[PDB]
Design an enzyme around this catalytic site. Structure first.
Site, PDB file in Angstrom:
ATOM      1  N   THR C 133       0.788  -1.230   0.000  1.00  0.00           N
ATOM      2  CA  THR C 133       0.000   0.000   0.000  1.00  0.00           C
ATOM      3  C   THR C 133       0.827   1.290   0.000  1.00  0.00           C
ATOM      4  O   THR C 133       1.795   1.439   0.759  1.00  0.00           O
ATOM      5  CB  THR C 133      -0.981  -0.016   1.204  1.00  0.00           C
ATOM      6  OG1 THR C 133      -1.823  -1.172   1.102  1.00  0.00           O
ATOM      7  CG2 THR C 133      -1.853   1.242   1.250  1.00  0.00           C
ATOM      8  N   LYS C 158      -1.635  -1.017  -4.088  1.00  0.00           N
ATOM      9  CA  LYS C 158      -2.830  -0.414  -3.500  1.00  0.00           C
ATOM     10  C   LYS C 158      -2.516   1.041  -3.183  1.00  0.00           C
ATOM     11  O   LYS C 158      -1.517   1.332  -2.528  1.00  0.00           O
ATOM     12  CB  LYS C 158      -3.278  -1.186  -2.255  1.00  0.00           C
ATOM     13  CG  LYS C 158      -4.416  -0.525  -1.480  1.00  0.00           C
ATOM     14  CD  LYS C 158      -5.296  -1.573  -0.816  1.00  0.00           C
ATOM     15  CE  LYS C 158      -6.116  -0.943   0.293  1.00  0.00           C
ATOM     16  NZ  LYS C 158      -7.118  -1.905   0.816  1.00  0.00           N
ATOM     17  N   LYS C 160      -3.906   4.565  -1.556  1.00  0.00           N
ATOM     18  CA  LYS C 160      -4.886   5.247  -0.713  1.00  0.00           C
ATOM     19  C   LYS C 160      -5.209   6.599  -1.322  1.00  0.00           C
ATOM     20  O   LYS C 160      -4.302   7.340  -1.748  1.00  0.00           O
ATOM     21  CB  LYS C 160      -4.381   5.434   0.723  1.00  0.00           C
ATOM     22  CG  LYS C 160      -4.161   4.140   1.488  1.00  0.00           C
ATOM     23  CD  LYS C 160      -5.491   3.472   1.819  1.00  0.00           C
ATOM     24  CE  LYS C 160      -5.292   2.247   2.680  1.00  0.00           C
ATOM     25  NZ  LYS C 160      -6.613   1.734   3.137  1.00  0.00           N
ATOM     26  N   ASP C 187      -8.157   2.668  -2.829  1.00  0.00           N
ATOM     27  CA  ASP C 187      -8.984   2.621  -1.635  1.00  0.00           C
ATOM     28  C   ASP C 187      -9.263   4.037  -1.153  1.00  0.00           C
ATOM     29  O   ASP C 187      -8.347   4.733  -0.723  1.00  0.00           O
ATOM     30  CB  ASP C 187      -8.297   1.796  -0.552  1.00  0.00           C
ATOM     31  CG  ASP C 187      -9.154   1.623   0.691  1.00  0.00           C
ATOM     32  OD1 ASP C 187     -10.206   2.303   0.808  1.00  0.00           O
ATOM     33  OD2 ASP C 187      -8.745   0.818   1.565  1.00  0.00           O
ATOM     34  N   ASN C 189     -11.346   4.879   1.349  1.00  0.00           N
ATOM     35  CA  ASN C 189     -11.672   4.920   2.785  1.00  0.00           C
ATOM     36  C   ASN C 189     -12.749   5.948   3.122  1.00  0.00           C
ATOM     37  O   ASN C 189     -12.622   6.749   4.050  1.00  0.00           O
ATOM     38  CB  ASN C 189     -10.412   5.130   3.658  1.00  0.00           C
ATOM     39  CG  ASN C 189      -9.530   3.890   3.727  1.00  0.00           C
ATOM     40  OD1 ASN C 189      -8.389   3.934   3.297  1.00  0.00           O
ATOM     41  ND2 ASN C 189     -10.052   2.783   4.280  1.00  0.00           N
ATOM     42  N   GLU C 215     -12.187   0.633  -3.935  1.00  0.00           N
ATOM     43  CA  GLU C 215     -12.767   0.279  -2.636  1.00  0.00           C
ATOM     44  C   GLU C 215     -13.438   1.431  -1.932  1.00  0.00           C
ATOM     45  O   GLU C 215     -12.860   2.516  -1.808  1.00  0.00           O
ATOM     46  CB  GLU C 215     -11.695  -0.186  -1.666  1.00  0.00           C
ATOM     47  CG  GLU C 215     -11.040  -1.473  -1.919  1.00  0.00           C
ATOM     48  CD  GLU C 215     -10.174  -1.878  -0.721  1.00  0.00           C
ATOM     49  OE1 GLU C 215     -10.681  -2.018   0.418  1.00  0.00           O
ATOM     50  OE2 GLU C 215      -8.977  -2.053  -0.920  1.00  0.00           O
ATOM     51  N   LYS C 264     -12.374  -8.693   5.810  1.00  0.00           N
ATOM     52  CA  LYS C 264     -11.289  -8.633   6.793  1.00  0.00           C
ATOM     53  C   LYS C 264     -11.705  -9.464   7.997  1.00  0.00           C
ATOM     54  O   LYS C 264     -12.798  -9.290   8.538  1.00  0.00           O
ATOM     55  CB  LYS C 264     -10.956  -7.203   7.213  1.00  0.00           C
ATOM     56  CG  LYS C 264     -10.471  -6.282   6.109  1.00  0.00           C
ATOM     57  CD  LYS C 264     -10.011  -4.972   6.726  1.00  0.00           C
ATOM     58  CE  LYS C 264      -9.721  -3.980   5.631  1.00  0.00           C
ATOM     59  NZ  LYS C 264      -9.062  -2.717   6.107  1.00  0.00           N
ATOM     60  N   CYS C 291      -6.613  -6.288   5.699  1.00  0.00           N
ATOM     61  CA  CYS C 291      -6.114  -6.346   7.067  1.00  0.00           C
ATOM     62  C   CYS C 291      -6.278  -4.992   7.750  1.00  0.00           C
ATOM     63  O   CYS C 291      -6.715  -4.005   7.108  1.00  0.00           O
ATOM     64  CB  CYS C 291      -4.636  -6.799   7.090  1.00  0.00           C
ATOM     65  SG  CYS C 291      -3.533  -5.699   6.126  1.00  0.00           S
ATOM     66  N   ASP C 316      -4.755  -8.168   0.070  1.00  0.00           N
ATOM     67  CA  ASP C 316      -4.148  -6.952   0.596  1.00  0.00           C
ATOM     68  C   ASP C 316      -3.740  -7.272   2.027  1.00  0.00           C
ATOM     69  O   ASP C 316      -4.376  -6.823   2.975  1.00  0.00           O
ATOM     70  CB  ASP C 316      -5.150  -5.775   0.538  1.00  0.00           C
ATOM     71  CG  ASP C 316      -4.622  -4.504   1.189  1.00  0.00           C
ATOM     72  OD1 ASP C 316      -3.410  -4.208   1.093  1.00  0.00           O
ATOM     73  OD2 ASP C 316      -5.435  -3.775   1.822  1.00  0.00           O
TER      74      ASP C 316
END
Ligand code: MN
Ligand code: MN
Ligand code: MN
Ligand code: MN
Ligand code: MN
Lengths: 344, 344, 344, 344, 344
Positions: C133, C158, C160, C187, C189, C215, C264, C291, C316
């Protein structure tokens, strides 16, 4: 003025007798009292009465996060209470503590403004009336307890069911015979299947018994099941365990799943509870307010909420009435089944 | 303390230039100011800026019901403000007056409590910022007006469209070129068909222009049309005329019709506006707040509402800025495009 | 054989650099290690890496309930693991601990059976491969970090995003240029509005960049928003925060809201995670596994889950790789970005 | 260890008397026994009891594909049982053989691990209880057989209906009178129209008879019809023939068509059966487990499945109880209506 | 007249080269020929070309049930063909045999009536035209094969895709360049995710290539996925594997999942295929007809079905053309890519 300290303390309250509901028997309430101290010297108080069954909480865990809670809100002025509410909305894993902290904030703020929490919230009502609850026991004992409650002057009797459909039907029918004039709330605490729940309702309807509110007959996640009961039996159906957050209530409304929501501050905090009141009044939903294991200081939170908003058709605020030997610590007047605002 | 008098008075305010929007052009704001007097001597103030196009109101009609409004609420203590709100919810035919009376109530109560309305409402923010509006005119004049607004320090520019799709597209594109860095709100005031509204959005998107909020492209009753625009064009779509009441918003949410609601106190009053904030925050709705023809005393109502709830991504609170040299009568600080809370 | 002790211990692990994601930045992982001891002497291990943002958990709270967890499962034979799973499903407020206890149970059982957890779970795969990530930082630093990851042999990167739409688009485009051949997971978030999320995807698509999995662009409760992004942008959309429980996933499936679920173990435990795999495989859902802040002993839980079920298109599982020089405590082989089953 | 051989053999089992259900009368079960031999010498066993009516299978056809089945899984280690399950999921045209091969795999694996299949599957329960079935005959004979079953100590009586609505209503009403205390499952084996099925249920409800589960009143493809019965009659409705695969069950859940699913390994194999258990537990569905014409070795498969998962409210595992002269070949204890796990 | 014998025989046919499709590669067709003999001496013929991947069938299994099939229909007059169709509808596990027996029945009846099967079915068309198929291979070989087909006079080219999105896009683009004027059918044989399927279509559309029919991009059970592709890409989407039965098609129609159904007699038999034609013609469905591995005698069944009903926009009846130098055993004229009715 600004918060300078926040204190959490364990308070234990023994019951007069074991309280038996579907899937749970308890003889004691272990609560966490919250004290917020301001720079002015004003002190506001709340109480978290946690629920493992409903909220997944444990009292040990609430106590463990005292320092975090303190750090999250220390230095904030209670006049900016929305900031405190938003911060404490992060405590969604500790909703009873969320509630206690939010109420303590309003308790402190109202003192600084020279008023009471009910007034900050609208001052809609001067008096409310609570039911009292009949726990699960033998049929004979359930009837005995319902009659006692009726003789005490309670006009609404809440009857726990959910563990034995046949005995539940028998108990409610026998209760009805000996408490003519009472209104009945039946709370199944997730104990029934959709079809069992419909049949309970039909059986008692057939005896000419009216159930004012039929609470949470099915499991928390079974929204479609709640709707099924609503659409196939004659009594108003309430979400309780299915209605913890404001988002839960939006879903229930969208799905037309329920006639009522039972708001509990211990599920929602003040923030979500206020949202739920607004959603309900915008959507043809009716409301009741309930409790977990609050003492008088904890029930105070719901009394001010209910007085102020005036949002509730029914009030199930009786946890403090089930305690063995307690010193009254509410900021309201208890007068039999009634609660009233203080002149001061 | 208790209301002892309620007074309504006509107040007229001249615009700096005629304000042209889809289907309406006006040069003057004729408002009704509300004064509530308490037995304590405290006086609270509100302002009704009526809308014939949106609410069906006429200023003469508002004035005519002074005695009824007075009878409805005289004798009620402002600490019981929820009672006053519920009573004034009956003024659904006079929503601007509903808003003015509800705000005047809170203005008076906050004074008795030694605080401000924003604080009664949560005290979430200390500062907000408004856009300013470009009315409909020739393309050249619209561009001139947008440049004027940009040079007055505004960072959000609201552009009226709706009467001429081709010229609206051109005006927005030309405005974008001379206001680099500004954010844009486009308000079509119900002027377009669903497909015209989609094509306006597409044309501007193809030029690399981002529209922050695209307001009410279609008619009030055309919820399905609003949804169509939402699902088929790249910018957030807002309900304005389609979102008058808390019930309207529940319907918009259920239908997934919009990305935004534009709350106006003149449509909703304080009561429904608070409900809408709660609904939106429980549903992934974003919010903006707008106005009609409020003077500074009128805009004060929205400034406190926005500061206190902190609910709005965008503020379109510019009616007082379009009015010709008034004596400032707000209870907030006007700092260019910014509004800030007072000390008090 | 039967559980004779359960021990919880705090274990802290330092990151190589602060890990910045939408609304959260951390430098340290504070986990709770679980040891289950059987009457045979066999010891099984799990790790709870709690999440305040996602699960509402605090590490101090997990530690506080050691005695309760011990009482709940002591005396139960691990061969009756479904009983332990059903009991620990009651720890829905402490999902990371639910996961750790459930895994420790299988770790112990597999040893008594002379096999490995992956084999108890089906033994579908011998090898999996993880992404690594890129945290949020300046665009220049994000690009630097992505290049570092690519030069560490990772084939899936990945990235962010979520705090700055314009910089996120730029960062992804610049990353794509310097990592030719890599696959990308983005991702967000929960940082974007539905329309912002659509426009992020469109901007990158227009550059000829493919995003393998996009995501959770929107908030946890915004299922309709997730669906909106899914239906209006070209890349597969995943639920992460919106998919905590097996019930969440049934709802996502019914609503056709997503292309992927990110399982997860820290959200779901073993019990719900197995349910989600079965639901997904019965519904045309694709899966990835992620995770929180697990160390190697914690990541072991997910490695066995992924090897055994073979359910995941993407992995991931990189938290242990972001931690600063630990002694390796997994029961798997870490082969660069690859994980392989042991011999045993 | 690795599979080295797979053997299929025809085994015939005569019934004590003809078994009559809607559209089918049979006097014998012709099954295919599966033996899997491992390189360790361990042998695992399953049984396919095919259904022409439900699955379209013929025993001759199952036997014909012995070589294909052998080639598909020979050389695979039973510890990688998920690989075997995925390969054998290709046998969707031979689902009874799919089931037998999958179970034989677990039978062999569990021996290699020193445990039993029920334990591999969770070990949830130590004992289960089966109903016994009343086939179709004259009303008098149906009553006679139901009374016999009740006298044998069966607490749940399964009653076949579906060929004659009037006689079905009469038979169930007469049965109820002479078996007071029994629970009833009614299985219509697709014999009724939606309206006929509702009327059967209403007629018996009117006599105060409760039907625990009302199975598959309508045709396999009539999902909307199943839902109609569910929504318009008082008893829980089960899918049987409509629930063959995990995908079928997802559809039933999405459509809210049923209260129950009757899982049969002969329809689903172990793979889909496990998925269905997980879907049901994620969706408020309840479960029963049934059978075709399995002998004791075949019923063993369902006994371990039911013991291990503990997923079933009701068990209809009685096919081996209808055989003329049989040598017991189960790996469980039969004890009247009860089945128990072996110490070994 | 009445059926006096039914004979099944294995017939093998070699391909000109291995036929590679998503998840399957074969070099040989192993079919079961059906001969029905009537008391009049008339003989009717059909052919079952089974599919393990689509129908779950094995040729050995079809052969094994010869005696059952014979018992089911011997003694029935072919003039009562609906009785034979209803009986053979029970062969839903052996759909290719269902088709062969149903066609053989009509082949015999038409002879007794002095006509042809196409005429029994309506005699709508005198001529149809088939595509020919490009199997999966290297891009260079796929292009070579397409050029070969174009030079054999085919005007519709069917291109297999599904195993490699990037190479599939390239292959189709390169094929389009060297077959100017051809129409294209693309068959993905369930190989893509919904989003991959959308992006295949978009990539080819952006090159100005039109795909006449885009067949079954997603898995059999993924109806919602089929619909997703339909609503989000520019070419007509067909169900193939998702359309096996008349019930499957009613579901596809209700869900608005597809633009086309590919009828194959080997999936549906004559009975369901006639139903599907009627459903499609009542619902704005368009139709194509396909095949498995039929030889000329097998393809005859589809040629008469297509000529008689005239129901198909496209015909993919090329299996016999991919087989290595057979003696022609159809009852139609093969005229390059055209098929024409005989005289008789
Ligand atoms: Mn309750
Ligand atoms: Mn507007
Ligand atoms: Mn994530
Ligand atoms: Mn059945
Ligand atoms: Mn095809």
């Amino acid at each position: 003025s600004r918060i300078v300290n926040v204190k959490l303390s364990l308070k234990r309250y023994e019951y007069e007798k074991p309280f038996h509901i579907t899937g749970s028997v308890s003889s004691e309430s272990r609560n966490v009292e919250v004290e917020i101290v301001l720079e002015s010297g004003v002190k506001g108080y709340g109480e978290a009465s946690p629920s493992f069954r409903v909220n997944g909480e444990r009292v040990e865990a609430l106590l463990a996060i005292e320092n975090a809670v303190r750090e999250m809100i220390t230095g904030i002025d209670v006049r900016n209470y929305a900031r405190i509410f938003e911060i404490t909305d992060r405590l969604f894993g500790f909703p009873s503590l969320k509630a206690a902290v939010q109420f303590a904030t309003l308790d402190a703020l109202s003192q600084e403004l020279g008023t009471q929490v009910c007034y900050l919230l609208g001052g809609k009502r001067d008096e409310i009336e609570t039911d009292k609850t009949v726990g699960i026991d033998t049929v004979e004992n359930r009837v005995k307890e319902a009659k006692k409650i009726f003789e005490e002057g309670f006009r609404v009797i809440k009857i726990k069911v959910g563990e034995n459909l046949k005995e539940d039907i028998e108990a409610v029918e026998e209760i009805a015979k000996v408490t003519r004039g009472a209104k009945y709330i039946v709370d199944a605490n997730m104990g029934y299947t959709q079809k069992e729940a419909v049949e309970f309702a039909r059986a008692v309807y057939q005896k000419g018994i009216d159930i004012a509110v039929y609470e949470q007959p099915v499991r928390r996640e079974d929204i479609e099941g709640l709707k099924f009961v609503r659409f196939h039996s004659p009594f108003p159906v309430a979400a309780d365990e299915s209605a913890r957050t404001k988002f839960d209530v939006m879903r229930l409304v969208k799905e037309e799943a329920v006639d009522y929501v039972n708001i509990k501050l211990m599920k929602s905090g003040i923030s979500d509870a206020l949202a739920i009141v607004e959603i309900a009044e915008s959507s043809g939903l009716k409301l009741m307010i309930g409790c977990m294991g609050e003492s008088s200081l904890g029930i105070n939170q719901s009394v001010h909420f209910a007085l102020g908003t005036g949002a509730f058709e029914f009030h199930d605020l009786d946890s403090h009435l089930m305690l063995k030997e307690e010193v009254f610590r509410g900021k309201f007047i208890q007068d039999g089944p009634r609660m009233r605002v203080k002149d001061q």
